[PDB]
């Protein structure tokens, strides 16, 4: 939920009340009675909690940030799942033994360099959540360095389909591709369904890019296509404008018609939101509020 780990290190090892040992500029801010909200609040403390603050502010203490700088590292390693969460009580029990064994002027200044690049040079972790080359760009640029670029029929639409497929894994942060076994896959979401067999799809689409099929043929592709190729073309449909594969290829009978099939449900869901909200507006059997509703929409 947080952005930075060192703020949680500054939340688990700093005093919540204002002390002059660490925040002098706020502890002296209220001794001299110069504060906007509640100014006159330090005279009326007795000699117990005046001298226990007014001595320690005009000459500060000299504490040791060794126990605090390591929590800005041990947290920064468990935020990125390098360590198990069940385990950080051991490594801080081992790093604090480490940097007190080999302590110097250098290591106290070398940890302090390392609690800055886990703050402002950990912006790469903010970066490839957006560009998602975790598993979407550099894991697919091996796939595009695997397919043959010499297709006999349809030389131009072959390199515009994968030009529209690299855009698919780029405009979606959740989708990713990977190497499992001798073939590459592609899931549209983490914790997600609809895994396409990406090797067994472009091998099915090879020798298929030029057909120029007529518009009176529907039930032939049970022995020609494969339903995951029929689902990969479903996942390429919203990111494919009308200028990719124009009109008369058999993919124009597929990719354009898949956008119309998505174009049905992206307005009939708004119809389905109306019907399920008027069954309780007039009084309708909720068991029979979905049987006849779906049959009108399928």
């Amino acid at each position: 939920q947080q952005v930075d780990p060192a703020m949680l290190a500054a939340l688990q090892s700093q005093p919540s009340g204002v002390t002059p040992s660490d925040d002098w500029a706020a502890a002296m801010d209220r001794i001299l009675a110069l504060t906007t909200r509640n100014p006159e609040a330090f005279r009326q403390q007795p000699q117990a909690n005046r001298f226990s603050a007014i001595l320690e502010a005009v000459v500060p203490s000299r504490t040791n940030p060794t126990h605090e700088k390591v929590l800005a590292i041990v947290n920064a390693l468990t935020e990125s799942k390098a360590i198990r969460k069940d385990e950080a009580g051991l490594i801080y029990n081992a790093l604090l033994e480490r940097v007190a064994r080999y302590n110097s002027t250098n290591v106290q200044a070398n940890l302090d360099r390392l609690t800055t690049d886990v703050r402002e040079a950990v912006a790469q972790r903010e970066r490839f959540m957006h560009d998602t080359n975790l598993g979407s760009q550099v894991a697919l640029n091996a796939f595009l360095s695997t397919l043959p670029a010499n297709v006999p029929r349809g030389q131009e639409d072959y390199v515009s389909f994968i030009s529209a497929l690299r855009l698919l894994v780029a405009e979606v942060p959740q989708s990713e591709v990977y190497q499992s076994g001798p073939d590459y896959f592609f899931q549209t979401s983490r914790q997600g369904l609809q895994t396409v067999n990406l090797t067994q799809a472009f091998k099915n689409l090879q020798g298929m890019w030029g057909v120029r099929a007529p518009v009176g043929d529907r039930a032939t592709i049970s022995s020609l296509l494969t339903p995951n190729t029929r689902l990969l073309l479903l996942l390429i449909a919203p990111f494919t404008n009308s200028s990719t594969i124009s009109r008369d290829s058999y993919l124009g009978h597929l990719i354009t018609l898949y956008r119309e099939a998505i174009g049905q449900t992206q307005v009939d869901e708004q119809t389905f939101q109306e019907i399920t909200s008027v069954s309780r507006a007039l009084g309708q059997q909720d068991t029979g509020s979905l049987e006849a509703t779906l049959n009108f929409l399928l």
Binding site: P46, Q47, A48, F51, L55
Partner: protein, 49 residues
């Protein structure tokens, strides 16, 4: 028959607590009259007889 009187009080199981404060009350642990000697290295003796 006539009678003198003589009396005592039994109060066992407890101390006699004298509080080192000013109004002799229990206002806190770090007492009232005590805390004016926090930064007074001032060797008070006492002949409590």
């Amino acid at each position: 028959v006539p009678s003198l009187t003589q009396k005592k009080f039994l109060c066992d199981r407890t101390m006699w607590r004298i509080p080192f404060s000013s109004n002799f009350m229990s206002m806190g642990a770090l007492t009232d009259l005590g805390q004016n000697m926090l930064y007074a290295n001032s060797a008070h003796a006492l002949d409590m007889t």
